[PDB]
Design a protein around this ligand. Structure first.
Ligand SMILES: [Cl-]
Length: 129
């Protein structure tokens, strides 16, 4: 599923990401845009053999199990494929655990480089939330 900007914003808010750990909704929509282009089926292979999954490109090195990242962790107690669902519940819940580990949203490289410092509010502008 490829979300609309506002549709994703609505779904994320509904799951309580708006100002979660002090990150306003626009941050999350911004991160989703540059990580996955709002596409829940997005996958990307990393150099170390791990793989990023879903709309927030969550990495199998620590956060999910994909059966081919040896010696990794599954801190979100999920199969990585669950992060590819059209329902973003799993990705959101896992994101909440990631953003809580002490490094905030800097865990998403796309957010740090493309969202951090900018007017993230622009990403939910025009949306009925
Ligand atoms: Cl991640």
């Amino acid at each position: 599923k490829v979300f609309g900007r506002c549709e994703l914003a609505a779904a994320m808010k509904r799951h309580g990401l708006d100002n979660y750990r002090g990150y306003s909704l626009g941050n999350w929509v911004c991160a989703a845009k540059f990580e996955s282009n709002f596409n829940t089926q997005a996958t990307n292979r990393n150099t170390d053999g791990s793989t990023d999954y879903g709309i927030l490109q969550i990495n199998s090195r620590w956060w999910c199990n994909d059966g081919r990242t040896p010696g990794s962790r599954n801190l979100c107690n999920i199969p990585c494929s669950a992060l590819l669902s059209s329902d973003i519940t799993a990705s959101v819940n896992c994101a909440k655990k990631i953003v809580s580990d002490g490094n905030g949203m800097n865990a998403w490289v796309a957010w740090r480089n493309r969202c951090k410092g900018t007017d993230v509010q622009a990403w939910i502008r025009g949306c009925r939330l």
